[PDB]
Amino acid sequence: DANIPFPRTSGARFCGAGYLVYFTRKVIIQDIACLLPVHKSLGELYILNVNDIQETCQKNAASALLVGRKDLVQVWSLATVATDLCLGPKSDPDLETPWARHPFGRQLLESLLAHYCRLRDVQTLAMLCSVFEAPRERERDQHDKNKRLLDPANTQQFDDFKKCYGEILYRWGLREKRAEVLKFVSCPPDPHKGIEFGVYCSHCRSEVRGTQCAICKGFTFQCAICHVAVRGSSNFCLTCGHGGHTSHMMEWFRTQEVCPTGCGCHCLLESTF
């Protein structure tokens, strides 16, 4: 038994997203989000909207002042000034210097990124990258690589920042923010592999993999409620195969509890495993 390890009667390790646990000679859970360079409340209050980038900047500045950090207000103010839509590059060099080559554009962003990388937090890094994400052939290619405000050589690093803040966000439990943030990734998504669904044709009764039949040139799935063609979400019944447009069966199963198609097939407890 000498070769065996020796008994351990203590321990203390990280868990969750802001807590610890120490089994040192019961166990105590103490919230320690005060020492992490990341703050959950900012994660709740933030907002990203590709429709209007300026609005996200001012609202984020307001939230930053609300949570009490006099650094993010400066950073977001510089951001909202920097991403003004009147500073857009032109697709011809021979007119004017791009804003990237200005010593207040790319270089300021690089300095701030280095500073927060030293601080070792992913929140502001991912947010800033998400916001800023927006012979003759050689000259055009070099100008194209030179217009943008984010260095093309660190796209993998920026994606890594984003997909790490995403795991943080999922850990916290506010996921819709994660689904918003994980769009700006330059990396294409992985597609799904396995089985897939097929809606038999409503006219020729053939299994067609799509919203439109390849033989009858019509709609293969018809709503079990409105009796029309559907293009949205289905969430149909797997036992009997009947289904419709999402609002319609949601309304049906609000109070009614039998298959509208008539096969009976009360799948409200069958499909829902």
Residues annotated within the binding site are 201, 204, 213, 216, 226, 237, 242, 245, 248, 259, 263, 265, 267
Cβ at position 155, least distance to other proteins in Å: 11
Measured CA to CA, the distance from residue 87 to residue 257 in angstroms comes to 59
Q: 132 or 236, CB closer to Zn ion?
A: 236
- Of these partners, Zn ion, other proteins, none, which one is at the site of residue 110 (CB under 5 to 8 Å by kind)? none
Q: 103 or 135, CB closer to other proteins?
A: 103
Element (H, E) at 14: strand 12-15
Measured CA to CA, the distance from residue 198 to residue 207 in angstroms comes to 6
- Of these partners, other proteins, Zn ion, none, which one is at the site of residue 209 (CB under 5 to 8 Å by kind)? other proteins
Question: What residues contact residue 86 under an 8 Å CB cut-off, 6+ apart?
Answer: none
- Of these partners, Zn ion, other proteins, none, which one is at the site of residue 89 (CB under 5 to 8 Å by kind)? none
Hey, what are 205's tokens? 């009764």
One-letter amino acid identity for 73? Answer: V
Neighbours of 223 (CB within 10 A): 20
Taking Cα atoms as reference points, which of 86, 66, 88, 87 lies closest to residue 76? 66
Cβ at position 95, least distance to other proteins in Å: 14
HEC string for 55-66: HHHHHHHHHHHH
Taking Cα atoms as reference points, which of 51, 50, 143 lies closest to residue 89? 143
Cβ at position 256, least distance to Zn ion in Å: 13
Interaction between residue 223 and Zn ion (CB under 5 A): yes
- Of these partners, Zn ion, other proteins, none, which one is at the site of residue 171 (CB under 5 to 8 Å by kind)? other proteins
Measured CA to CA, the distance from residue 13 to residue 23 in angstroms comes to 9
The owner of tokens 């947010």 is 127
Interaction between residue 75 and Zn ion (CB under 5 A): no
Binding positions for Zn(2+) are 201, 204, 213, 216, 226, 237, 242, 245, 248, 259, 263, 265, 267
| Interactions with Zn ion, residue window 153-212 (CB under 5 A) | 201, 203-204
Interaction between residue 267 and Zn ion (CB under 5 A): yes
Residue ranges binding Zn ion (CB under 5 A) = 201, 203-204, 213, 215-216, 223, 226, 237, 239-240, 242, 244-245, 248, 259, 261, 263, 265, 267
